[PDB]
Amino acid sequence: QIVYKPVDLSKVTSKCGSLGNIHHKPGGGQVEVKSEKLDFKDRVQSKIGSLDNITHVPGGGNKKIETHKLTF
Amino acid sequence: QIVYKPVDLSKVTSKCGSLGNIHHKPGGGQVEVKSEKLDFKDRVQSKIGSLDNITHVPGGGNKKIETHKLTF
Amino acid sequence: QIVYKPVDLSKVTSKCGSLGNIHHKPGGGQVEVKSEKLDFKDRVQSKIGSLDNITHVPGGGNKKIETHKLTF
Amino acid sequence: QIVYKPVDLSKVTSKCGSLGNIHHKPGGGQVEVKSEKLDFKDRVQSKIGSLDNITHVPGGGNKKIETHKLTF
Amino acid sequence: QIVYKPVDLSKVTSKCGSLGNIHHKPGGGQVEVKSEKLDFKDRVQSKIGSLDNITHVPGGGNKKIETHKLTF
Amino acid sequence: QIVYKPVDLSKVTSKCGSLGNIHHKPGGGQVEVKSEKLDFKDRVQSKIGSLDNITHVPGGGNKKIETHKLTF
């Protein structure tokens, strides 16, 4: 008699990219008089209090190769 | 007699990209008099208090290859 | 008699990328009179109080190769 | 001429009670053979690996009393 | 001439009770053979791996009293 | 001419109770054979690997009393 009962009970997780929490609070203080004068003239690039979150995940893949043979 | 009963009970999860929470609160402070003057003339790029979230996931795939043979 | 009963009870986790929490609070202080004059003229790149979070994950993949053979 | 323009720009916050994070991981280790025999017979009180979080806040109230008078 | 124009721009917040995160993961470890035998007979109280969160907030109230008079 | 323009730009915060993070990891080690025999007979009180977090906040209140009078 032969019994062939291999059991895959496994658990696999991938968690990839921007996982953590971001808190961005620019200008959260106290001021009496606030004045901003912006003069931008030629080919200017500007970020003021902005948030860019850029995420690339080519990875994070799960791969199982499993071979079962019984030869009698 | 032969019994061939391999069992795949496994669990596989992929979680890929922007997973975390974003909190963006620009300008949330206290001000009495606030003034802004913006003068932008030629090929200016500006972000003020804006949020960009860019997510690319070519990955995060799950792949199973499983071969079963019994030869008697 | 033969019994062939290997059990994969394994647990595998990948956690890859920006895992930690970010707190960015520029300008959170106390001031009476605040004035800003910005004059940007020619091919200027500028960041003021802005947040860039850039995450690349080509890794963080999980791979299982498992071969089972019983030859009688 | 009289101008009566007192300005309340104030910000008030109360944050009272269980503010912090609790992480409770009883039994998170590695064991080959684990056995537990519990025999509790008369007026026994028992906690095993349980979490009680009890919060009472009679406080944390915010109170403003403000009186404005102009007598001419 | 008289102008009576007091301004309340104020912000008031109460946040009272169980504010923080609870993570309770009893039994998250690794065991080969696990056995538990429980025999409880008379007026026994038991908690095993359970979570109680009890919150009482008689407080956390906001109260504003504001009086305005102009007498001419 | 008279101008009466006191400005309240104040910021007030109360943060009261259990503020800090708790990490409780009982039994996180390595053992081959673990056995526990508990026999509790008469009016026993027992805590094993349990977490009690008890918070009382009758305080943490914010109070403003402000009086403005102009007599002409």
d(CA C6, CA A8): 9
Q: Chain F within 8 Å of E10 (Cβ-Cβ)?
A: yes
Inter-chain touch E57–D17, beta carbons under 8 Å: yes
> F-contacting residues of E 33-62, CB under 8 Å?
47, 59
The alpha-carbon gap from E36 to the nearest alpha carbon of chain F, in Å, equals 10
Q: Which two tokens stand for residue A14?
A: 């991938």
Inter-chain touch A50–C50, beta carbons under 8 Å: yes
The alpha-carbon gap from E46 to the nearest alpha carbon of chain F, in Å, equals 10
Minimal Cα distance from D22: which residue of F? F22
Classified as helix, coil or strand, E67 is strand
Residue C18 · residue B53 · CB < 8 Å: no
Distances (CA, A) of B33 to C24, C46, D9, D11, F9: 25, 26, 11, 16, 11
Distances (CA, A) of B49 to A24, A26, A50, C34, D34: 10, 8, 4, 19, 57
Minimal Cα distance from F55: which residue of D? D55
Q: Chain B within 8 Å of D7 (Cβ-Cβ)?
A: yes
Minimal Cα distance from D10: which residue of B? B30
d(CA B38, CA A70): 77
Span between the terminal Cα atoms of chain D, in Å? 11
b vs e for A19-56, b when ≥16 Cβ sit within 10 Å of the residue's Cβ? beebebbbbbbbbbebebebebbeebbbbbbbbbbbbb
Extended strands (E) in chain E: 2-4, 7-8, 11-18, 22-24, 30-40, 45-48, 51-56, 62-71
> What resolution (Å)?
2.2
Number of C-beta neighbours around residue B10 at 10 A: 17
Residue F28 · residue D72 · CB < 8 Å: no
d(CA F61, CA E61): 9
Distances (CA, A) of A12 to A59, B8, C41, F28, F42: 15, 13, 54, 22, 47
Minimal Cα distance from A31: which residue of F? F9
Beta strand E7-8 with A45-48 is unpaired
The alpha-carbon gap from B63 to the nearest alpha carbon of chain C, in Å, equals 10
Q: What pairs with residue D63 in β-bridges?
A: E63, F63
Which chain E positions have a beta carbon within 8 Å of D62's beta carbon? Answer: 12-14, 61-63
d(CA A54, CA C18): 11
Classified as helix, coil or strand, A1 is coil
